[PDB]
Design a protein around this ligand. Structure first.
Ligand SMILES: CC(=O)N[C@@H]1[C@@H](O)[C@H](O[C@@H]2O[C@H](CO)[C@@H](O[C@@H]3O[C@H](CO)[C@@H](O)[C@H](O)[C@H]3NC(C)=O)[C@H](O)[C@H]2NC(C)=O)[C@@H](CO)O[C@H]1O
Ligand code: CL
Ligand code: CL
Ligand code: NA
Length: 129
């Protein structure tokens, strides 16, 4: 599923991401935009053999099991394919654990390089929230 911008904003708010660990909703929408282009089915292989999955590009070295990332963990206790669903529940629940793990939203490379320190509120302009 390719979400609309305000559609995804509404979904993340309902699932409790707006100001989760202090990160306003626009941060999460900006992260999703540049990680996946709002596409729940996005996948991308990394040089270390791991793969990033879903709307928030959650990585199989740490967070989910995809059966092909040796020596990895599965800290969200979830198959990585669950992160590709049109229902973003699994991705949001896992994202809450990632952002709580010490480095905040710096765990998302695209967030650090393209959202951090910008006017992220613009990502929820015009949305009925
Ligand atoms: C969205 C996503 O999947 N991002 C991936 C990053 O999570 C991952 O970075 C590494 O993440 C782990 C887990 O959070 C980091 O380990 C944690 O480090 C903190 C700070 O030192 C420490 O307090 C925690 O105890 C420790 N947790 C565990 C379970 O060990 C690790 O430092 C990150 N590595 C970095 C930032 O280089 C990166 C790299 O695999 O991939 C992203 O896609
Ligand atoms: Cl915001
Ligand atoms: Cl933080
Ligand atoms: Na894994």
């Amino acid at each position: 599923k390719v979400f609309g911008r305000c559609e995804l904003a509404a979904a993340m708010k309902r699932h409790g991401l707006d100001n989760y660990r202090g990160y306003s909703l626009g941060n999460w929408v900006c992260a999703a935009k540049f990680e996946s282009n709002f596409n729940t089915q996005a996948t991308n292989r990394n040089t270390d053999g791991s793969t990033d999955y879903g709307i928030l590009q959650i990585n199989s070295r740490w967070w989910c099991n995809d059966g092909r990332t040796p020596g990895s963990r599965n800290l969200c206790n979830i198959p990585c394919s669950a992160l590709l669903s049109s229902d973003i529940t699994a991705s949001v629940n896992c994202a809450k654990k990632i952002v709580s793990d010490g480095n905040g939203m710096n765990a998302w490379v695209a967030w650090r390089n393209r959202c951090k320190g910008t006017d992220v509120q613009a990502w929820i302009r015009g949305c009925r929230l």
